[PDB]
Amino acid sequence: YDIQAWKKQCEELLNLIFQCEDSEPFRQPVDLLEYPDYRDIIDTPMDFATVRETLEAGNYESPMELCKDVRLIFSNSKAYTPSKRSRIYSMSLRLSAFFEEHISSVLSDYKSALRFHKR
Numbered sequence: 001y002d003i004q005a006w007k008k009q010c011e012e013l014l015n016l017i018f019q020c021e022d023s024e025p026f027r028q029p030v031d032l033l034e035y036p037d038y039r040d041i042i043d044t045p046m047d048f049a050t051v052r053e054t055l056e057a058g059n060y061e062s063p064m065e066l067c068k069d070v071r072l073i074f075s076n077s078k079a080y081t082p083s084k085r086s087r088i089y090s091m092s093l094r095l096s097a098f099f100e101e102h103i104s105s106v107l108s109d110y111k112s113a114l115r116f117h118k119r
């Protein structure tokens, strides 16, 4: 029932994501010189370095907020892809499956700890 445990769990999951070759396109903000129309489609850019920096600055209050930003990385990829068969989008789908598989226990444990705190 540790209310704070999610933070280090998220740090470790981000470390695993950075070791995945599938995270390459998502490690830093999308390069606007490479994709000049990116901001005409995507209103809120997001990337894993921004997520890691937000976490390390103490600017996430819960793992749900971190999960919302990670999911935005994947929805941006889906919105920007010209095809569902594109390389970068295909990498985003595998990385999303990996992330969802690992974040589920983090969210469950945190929500359970909060419920215990308010019992």
Ligand SMILES: COc1ccc2nc(NC(=O)C3CC3)sc2c1
Binding pocket: 030, 035, 076, 077, 078, 080, 081, 082, 083, 086, 087, 088, 089
């Ligand atoms: C910024 O995130 C994405 C997501 C999907 C994505 N699909 C792409 N496709 C191409 O470049 C084709 C050779 C023409 S570039 C790209 C970039």
